[PDB]
Amino acid sequence: KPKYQVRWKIIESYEGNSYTFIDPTQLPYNEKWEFPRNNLQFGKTLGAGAFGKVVEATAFGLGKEDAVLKVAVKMLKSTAHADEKEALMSELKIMSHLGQHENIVNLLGACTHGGPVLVITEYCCYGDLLNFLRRKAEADLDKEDGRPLELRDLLHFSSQVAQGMAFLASKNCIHRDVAARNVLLTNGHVAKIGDFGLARDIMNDSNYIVKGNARLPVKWMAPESIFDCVYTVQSDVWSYGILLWEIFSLGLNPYPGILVNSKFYKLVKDGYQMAQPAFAPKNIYSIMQACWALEPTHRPTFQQICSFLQEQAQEDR
């Protein structure tokens, strides 16, 4: 139409050489997540998109009777396209199924009776990584005032996302939209990877380009995804290299000013790459370059990258 959808996938297998993915529609909703709508106290909108919004709420009695806890709750618009209504449910499901991790935005519960479906996730008080970076980069002190960004901060964001990604990969999960806009920062500026597409307006985002069938983040995509339509863990690693660029350029748009052709697609497949970002050390740039290997199997792994970046961040004796 297009409709709202999150583009995560989970592999069943495995055996082709072809992938068969889980149909989330057939997954069961575990009722353990159910939370009373009235035990939520709604607050400010964290982001409102074309298909729905993401709202901050205060939850009472979640996981413990006395608990008071700031949460993020996802919801669709009143005029929801019949499903969608299911995509939000899928949702949820894929996400039950994955389990918890420190560096992913975690599911906390859901409201499925007494009104429209609500999905309760972890609240992230500093918002998305992209805006944070851009807000610290802007030169005006009435807006932002704080400690100056340093290399160690950028390494922390990078290793924290890599770790979250290493987890998903371990659980046969392909994100399909790793990007600074989808990394959210929690207490102590700890990075978490999720999907914040509901909060954004996809129809007027120059990052999402009509590629025949759908509207895809082509600048963050491996050549074989464009191609060719192949998505893998290695394909998410390519997107991570783009994310690395996003981080070490402090929020600049990838391939800045490049006319997204053709042609552009062919040039990338024939091995065009972005120049070194302003604030990337040579050795971080060489991670980017490795993430953009034309041979998917020559790309590094999230765990490798994670370890390397945790090592680099280590303050000397």
UniProtKB/Swiss-Prot annotation:
Residues 195-217 are annotated as: Activation loop. The modification Phosphotyrosine is found at residues 4, 19, 208. Residues 1-32 are annotated as: Regulatory juxtamembrane domain. It is found in: Cell membrane. Autophosphorylated in response to CSF1 or IL34 binding. Phosphorylation at Tyr-19 is important for normal down-regulation of signaling by ubiquitination, internalization and degradation. Phosphorylation at Tyr-19 and Tyr-208 is important for interaction with SRC family members, including FYN, YES1 and SRC, and for subsequent activation of these protein kinases. Changing residue 181 to H: In HDLS1; impairs autophosphorylation upon stimulation with CSF1. Induction: Up-regulated by glucocorticoids. Changing residue 208 to F: Reduced kinase activity. Reduced interaction with SRC, FYN and YES1. ATP binds at residues 46-54, 74. Tyrosine-protein kinase that acts as a cell-surface receptor for CSF1 and IL34 and plays an essential role in the regulation of survival, proliferation and differentiation of hematopoietic precursor cells, especially mononuclear phagocytes, such as macrophages and monocytes. Promotes the release of pro-inflammatory chemokines in response to IL34 and CSF1, and thereby plays an important role in innate immunity and in inflammatory processes. Interacts with INPPL1/SHIP2 and THOC5. Monomer. Homodimer. Interacts with CSF1 and IL34. Interaction with dimeric CSF1 or IL34 leads to receptor homodimerization. Interacts (tyrosine phosphorylated) with PLCG2 (via SH2 domain). Interacts (tyrosine phosphorylated) with PIK3R1 (via SH2 domain). Interacts (tyrosine phosphorylated) with FYN, YES1 and SRC (via SH2 domain). Interacts (tyrosine phosphorylated) with CBL, GRB2 and SLA2. This is Macrophage colony-stimulating factor 1 receptor. It comes from Homo sapiens. The gene is CSF1R. The chain holds residues 543 to 918 of 972 of the full protein.
